[PDB]
Every structure is written in structure tokens, then in C-alpha cells.
Amino acid sequence: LIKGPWTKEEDQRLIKLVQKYGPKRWSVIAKHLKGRIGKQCRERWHNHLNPE
Numbered sequence: 176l177i178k179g180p181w182t183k184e185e186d187q188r189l190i191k192l193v194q195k196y197g198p199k200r201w202s203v204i205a206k207h208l209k210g211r212i213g214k215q216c217r218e219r220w221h222n223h224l225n226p227e
């Protein structure tokens with residue numbers, strides 16, 4: 176499956192997954208998010224949820 180815009184529910188789940196796995200295991204994190212691949216999770220984290 177392929178998803179486009181992120182929902183608030185997905186963002187919340189991503190926050191919890193990064194807390195569990197850390198910001199380097201993107202492939203494992205993506206396995207828990209339907210329709211998402213590792214790079215999408217990485218970009219959502221660095222650009223929107225945890226900006227510099």
C-alpha cells in the first residue's frame with residue numbers, strides 16, 4: 176500500500192516507535208506503519224516531528 180499525507184494518528188504512532196527503537200532503525204519502524212517505507216518515516220521525523 177502507498178500513503179500520501181500523514182494523519183495525526185500516524186504521527187502519534189511514529190513518535191512512540193521512535194521512542195522504542197531510536198532514530199536509526201527506520202526499516203523496523205516502517206514495518207509497524209501500514210503504507211509507509213523507512214525513508215518516509217525518517218523524513219517525517221527530521222522535517223516535522225523533531226526539527227533541528
Ligand SMILES: [N+]
Pocket residue numbers: 205206207208209210211212
Ligand atoms: N509498512
